[PDB]
Amino acid sequence: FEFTLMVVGESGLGKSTLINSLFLTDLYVEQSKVLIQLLLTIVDTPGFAVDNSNCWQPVIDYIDSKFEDYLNAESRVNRRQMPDNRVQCCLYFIAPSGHGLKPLDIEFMKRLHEKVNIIPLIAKADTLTPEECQQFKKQIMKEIQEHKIKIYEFPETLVKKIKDRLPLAVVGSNTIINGEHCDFTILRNMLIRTHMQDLKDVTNNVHYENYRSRKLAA
Amino acid sequence: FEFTLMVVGESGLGKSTLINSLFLVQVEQSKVLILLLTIVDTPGFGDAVDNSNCWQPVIDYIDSKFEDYLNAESRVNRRQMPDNRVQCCLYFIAPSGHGLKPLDIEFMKRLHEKVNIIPLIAKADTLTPEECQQFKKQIMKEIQEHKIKIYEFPETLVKKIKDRLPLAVVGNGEHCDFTILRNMLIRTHMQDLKDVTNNVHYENYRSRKLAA
Numbered sequence: 422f423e424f425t426l427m428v429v430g431e432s433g434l435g436k437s438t439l440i441n442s443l444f445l446t447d448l449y450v451e452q453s454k455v456l457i458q459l460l461l462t463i464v465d466t467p468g469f470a471v472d473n474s475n476c477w478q479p480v481i482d483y484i485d486s487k488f489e490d491y492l493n494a495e496s497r498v499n500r501r502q503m504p505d506n507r508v509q510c511c512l513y514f515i516a517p518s519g520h521g522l523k524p525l526d527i528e529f530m531k532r533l534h535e536k537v538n539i540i541p542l543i544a545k546a547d548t549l550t551p552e553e554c555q556q557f558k559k560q561i562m563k564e565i566q567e568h569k570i571k572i573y574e575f576p577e578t579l580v581k582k583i584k585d586r587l588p589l590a591v592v593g594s595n596t597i598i599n600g601e602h603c604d605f606t607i608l609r610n611m612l613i614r615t616h617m618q619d620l621k622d623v624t625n626n627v628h629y630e631n632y633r634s635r636k637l638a639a
Numbered sequence: 640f641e642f643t644l645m646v647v648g649e650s651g652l653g654k655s656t657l658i659n660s661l662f663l664v665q666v667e668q669s670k671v672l673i674l675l676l677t678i679v680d681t682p683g684f685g686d687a688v689d690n691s692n693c694w695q696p697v698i699d700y701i702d703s704k705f706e707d708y709l710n711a712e713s714r715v716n717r718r719q720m721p722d723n724r725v726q727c728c729l730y731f732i733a734p735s736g737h738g739l740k741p742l743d744i745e746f747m748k749r750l751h752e753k754v755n756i757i758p759l760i761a762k763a764d765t766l767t768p769e770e771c772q773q774f775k776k777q778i779m780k781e782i783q784e785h786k787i788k789i790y791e792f793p794e795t796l797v798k799k800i801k802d803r804l805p806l807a808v809v810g811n812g813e814h815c816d817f818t819i820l821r822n823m824l825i826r827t828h829m830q831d832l833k834d835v836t837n838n839v840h841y842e843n844y845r846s847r848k849l850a851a
């Protein structure tokens with residue numbers, strides 16, 4: 422089994438902790454690989470304060486790096502050996518503070534949303550309150566469906582009402598002890614299985630192809 | 640009694656709630672009496688990105704107030720002057736970090752001598768006592784490293800709170816630093832703030848402007 426998981430948030434969002442918080446390890450653009458026959462590439466972005474303005478392109482050009490390299494492989498003389506470097510998922514961390522969606526977020530998402538599968542986790546929810554959380558999410562989704570964005574949507578089914586229970590709110594735990602108050606488990610389930618295979622499916626089918634038709638003007 | 644209090648943090652930091660919590664780009668001002676307080680809210684910081692520059696907006700507002708005050712003090716008949724100057728800036732550090740976000744370090748070390756910085760540590764219902772501890776110490780290390788001036792409490796009771804700073808907040812003084820502020824909040828204690836503003840910052844401005 423392989424996986425390539427990209428994490429994206431501004432610093433100090435407790436992501437790099439939460440990763441281990443499912444996967445119980447580490448405290449490691451950048452990539453840290455987990456096996457324990459079963460592989461995960463992990464992708465950390467160092468960047469995302471100061472101006473903050475352009476960069477997103479760094480992410481982009483890395484994605485389309487992986488794509489164009491994969492294509493230029495698929496058309497190669499003897500197609501044989503190709504390993505898959507493409508990025509199935511980007512787990513993305515929204516600032517837990519807000520009344521809304523910070524323009525930085527709205528910009529990155531609507532920028533890269535069709536170049537990868539966005540899983541907008543809501544960060545560090547030990548900040549928030551059930552009502553606060555509620556109004557928050559709804560405010561988000563309103564912000565998106567207003568801004569007309571595509572985040573990868575879970576097809577099959579159990580996952581029926583979690584279309585509604587999204588966006589997703591999180592807590593870092595290696596802490597000595599939980600899906601109750603958090604959305605943690607309700608991810609970890611959807612993490613392990615089988616939903617990755619669906620993710621790779623949507624990446625390779627949807628995003629990649631659109632890239633491939635795209636590049637071809639000549 | 641009068642006061643002018645400036646609040647500064649990126650949006651969604653729960654400041655504008657905390658203000659009431661004691662009291663029950665652009666720059667701009669609310670005001671109140673309940674004994675006057677002008678309050679000063681900054682719309683911009685946070686959001687943006689690009690925020691490459693801003694902070695000058697704050698500056699030019701400060702030195703607006705100053706230069707207007709001076710140009711008053713030298714006026715034909717000096718008589719009537721009201722004081723618009725800013726005694727205090729309560730400043731909110733991002734509760735998340737392992738450290739001090741470059742945005743902060745830039746604003747502070749930018750305006751630290753143009754006003755009295757009171758760097759509250761934001762929304763501490765985020766944090767943990769150990770987390771909070773290492774956080775503060777990390778901050779102070781960041782400052783004394785970056786050699787910054789935040790207004791320092793004279794007198795005295797406030798003896799060990801020089802140590803108990805930086806200051807951590809909730810929108811109860813037990814777990815929070817809330818009360819340990821509210822006490823130190825203006826009362827007679829503002830009088831020291833106005834003192835340092837008008838004595839220290841203002842004057843330095845006044846000598847400054849005078850090259851000609």
Ligand SMILES: Nc1nc2c(ncn2[C@@H]2O[C@H](COP(=O)(O)OP(=O)(O)O)[C@@H](O)[C@H]2O)c(=O)[nH]1
Binds near residue numbers: 765770
């Ligand atoms: N409020 C909150 N804080 C957390 C959480 N997880 C970790 N932290 C704290 O936030 C700090 C930064 O977390 P980290 O994993 O380094 O996030 P990252 O720097 O964005 O990758 C850590 O020192 C943790 O103590 C969480 O779920 N909620």
Ligand SMILES: Nc1nc2c(ncn2[C@@H]2O[C@H](COP(=O)(O)OP(=O)(O)O)[C@@H](O)[C@H]2O)c(=O)[nH]1
Binds near residue numbers: 810
């Ligand atoms: N966990 C936590 N949440 C807070 C706190 N203060 C405010 N909030 C929540 O976060 C949001 C920010 O509050 P607000 O005063 O509007 O922040 P501001 O815009 O920066 O002044 C509000 O909707 C509150 O529900 C706090 O001290 N702790």
